[PDB]
């Protein structure tokens, strides 16, 4: 490096030019290629120069700051390799401390990085010191930040030194200051799994238990997570005696924050605790927070329903079900709040298979219906957007006979908003219950929106009856629309004869040629003769509609004839659009 006097510390001075300029987003580019700094400087220089620059001059930004964090993690060969690793540890305890908290979390991730790159000997030498010093910092970021770094510098250390960052990791969870705790609360587990079992039984649960009833809620939330993470780490045997107690302690807290977490967490509690405790402890609590007076509890405990059902055993399963949580699901199906309802409905379908087609039909069916019922839109929309678990179970027959009736009762709603939703489901209908589904009925309903004298509801209508053809196919049409089209040409009901030409309006559209001239075009033509004007313009603007579809010949000896004498009616519009409809077709 004697051969560099010319240059002493030229790169040095490049960096600390572009460093100098007022456009942030640029001086950003020049900290990711601080490398090229380094390499045209030497691994000596890089240490003893641009390290100790990097420690304390830099004053910028916090978008840089952050990206100055993620450098020196990749910094470990470009300084020297593993013997000069811990040479990064003072640039990145001064980014540890910052003010942003998302700087300091990129110099902690940096940290654990290059922790792995320093040898037992260097941990205990350097790595350790640093995560004391943090610890005992006199800025509680200091202590928050060091809490992260327990885990992995733990493993590698001496015995006498794991007593040590025990002992340190302890003092924070009892730290003055709340930021403080919350921090030592949320890496307690990670923590606990790089322990041995011994100190996890001795020194965990006491530290586990105390933050569980500390006297600060949001400190007391995050036990929970923990309570699930000791869990796992533990054979069934000690469950009972070292950590059913706080788990217990935490279902009945007086803060519904801390209820909330438990119910949020119950499947994997679940998991974690096994069957047999399930059965005695979690089936009771889980029967609590269904009835929790708060309905924020209410509604997690709402959507675990059908997980907790599923994961019971197959030996007492159905028992339990049927006898302790069926009578607690008809209450929540009149809770009085909409979330509490929608959590439920999103779910409770998916008991069905679980619960057999006879208790399906007998206990869930009836459940099933007075959610579909509900007024809050959401609520009716999970139910219909999960029909395939109860098909699959009972069959289509069987469902349809049940939730057709109650389709039909919302498809004529007074209010436009709800007639309206019900189109909407008829894509999640057919997509999930198919082409054998789409019966009589069913095949009614879609044509009768066509005359609503709402026009969104006549707009919607129309795509749908086009989507469905699209889907099923024009020879579906054929066979199973057109029949009943044409029979409603018949009706003495006017409406009825109105739906017909509608009808004939949109599937002239998407069944072609063929089908339009030979089996709905002779329809259209006898209609002309109808008493009831209103029908008999409509026939001339049908005709108008669908004219173009057929053929010239067909228009000039079997279209033309007809709007001429419709031009000769004695209505005002019949006349009116009897023309318009032979100019707009140029039979002019």
């Known amino acids: 490096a004697a051969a560099d006097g010319d240059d002493s510390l030229y790169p040095i001075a490049v960096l600390i030019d572009e460093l100098r300029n007022e456009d942030v987003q640029l001086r950003l580019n020049s900290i990711k290629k601080l490398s090229t700094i380094a390499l045209a400087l030497g691994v000596e220089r890089t240490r003893s120069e641009l390290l100790p620059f990097l420690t304390d001059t830099i004053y910028d930004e916090d978008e840089v700051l952050l990206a100055l964090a993620e450098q020196l ?8 390799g593993p013997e000069y690793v811990h040479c990064l540890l003072p640039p990145l305890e001064s980014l540890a401390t910052v003010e942003e908290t998302v700087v300091r979390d990129k110099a902690v991730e940096s940290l654990r990085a290059i922790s792995h790159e320093h040898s037992p000997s260097d941990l205990e030498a350097h790595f350790v010191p640093l995560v004391k010093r943090l610890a005992g910092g006199d800025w509680f970021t200091s202590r928050t930040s060091a809490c992260g770094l327990f885990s992995v510098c733990y493993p590698r250390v001496s015995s006498a030194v794991k007593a040590e960052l025990r002992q340190y990791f302890r003092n924070l969870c009892s730290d003055d200051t709340p930021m403080v705790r919350r921090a030592a609360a949320s890496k307690l587990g990670e923590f606990a799994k790089v322990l041995e079992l011994d100190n996890v039984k001795s020194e965990i649960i006491p530290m586990f238990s105390n933050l569980a009833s500390d006297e600060q ?4 939330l995050l036990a929970v997570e923990a309570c699930v993470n000791i869990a796992q780490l533990l054979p069934q045997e000690d469950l009972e005696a070292l950590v059913m107690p706080t788990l217990r302690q935490a279902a009945e807290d007086k803060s ?9 967490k119950f499947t994997e509690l679940q998991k974690a605790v096994g069957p047999e405790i399930t059965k005695t402890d979690l089936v009771p609590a889980f029967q609590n927070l269904m009835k929790d007076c708060e309905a924020e509890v209410r509604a997690a405990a709402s959507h675990k329903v059908k997980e907790f059902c599923e994961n019971l055993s197959a030996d007492c399963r159905e028992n339990v079900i049927m006898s302790q949580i069926l009578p607690c699901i008809k209450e929540l199906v009149s809770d009085a709040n909409q979330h509490v309802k929608s959590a439920l409905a999103s779910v409770i379908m ?17 459940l099933f219906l007075a959610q579909l019922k509900d007024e809050c839109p959401e609520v009716r929309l999970n139910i219909i957007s999960n029909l395939d678990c109860v098909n699959e179970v009972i069959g289509i027959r069987q469902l349809s006979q049940s939730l057709l009736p109650a389709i039909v009762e919302l498809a004529e709603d007074a209010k436009w908003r709800v007639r309206l939703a019900i189109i909407e489901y008829m894509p999640l209908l057919a997509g999930q219950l198919g082409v054998e589904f789409f019966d009589e009925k069913l095949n009614s309903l879609c044509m009768a929106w066509l005359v609503d004298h709402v026009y969104a509801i006549r707009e919607a209508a129309t795509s749908n009856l086009k989507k469905l053809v699209e889907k099923f196919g024009k020879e579906w049409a054929h066979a199973t629309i057109i029949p009943k089209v044409l029979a409603m040409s018949g009706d003495p009901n006017y409406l009825h004869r109105m739906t017909t030409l509608f009808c004939i309006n949109v599937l002239s559209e998407v069944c072609g040629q063929d089908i339009t001239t030979k089996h709905m075009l002779p329809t259209v033509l006898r209609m002309a003769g109808d008493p009831v004007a209103n029908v008999r313009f409509n026939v001339a603007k049908s005709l108008q ?8 010949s067909t228009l000039q000896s079997e279209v033309k004839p ?13 006349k009116y659009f009897a023309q ?6 140029s039979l002019a």
């Open 73 to 80: 993690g990749t910094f470990t060969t470009l300084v020297g």
């Open 217 to 220: 809620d949001s400190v007391r």
């Open 256 to 264: 519904w924050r801390v209820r909330y977490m438990v119910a949020d």
């Open 350 to 366: 998916g008991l069905s298979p679980i619960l057999g087609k006879d208790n399906t039909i007998e206990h869930l069916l009836p």
């Open 545 to 552: 509609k669908i004219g173009p579809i057929l053929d010239n």
């Open 562 to 574: 007809i709007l001429e004498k419709l031009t000769q009616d004695q209505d005002v519009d019949v």
């Open 580 to 585: 318009e409809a032979l100019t707009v077709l």
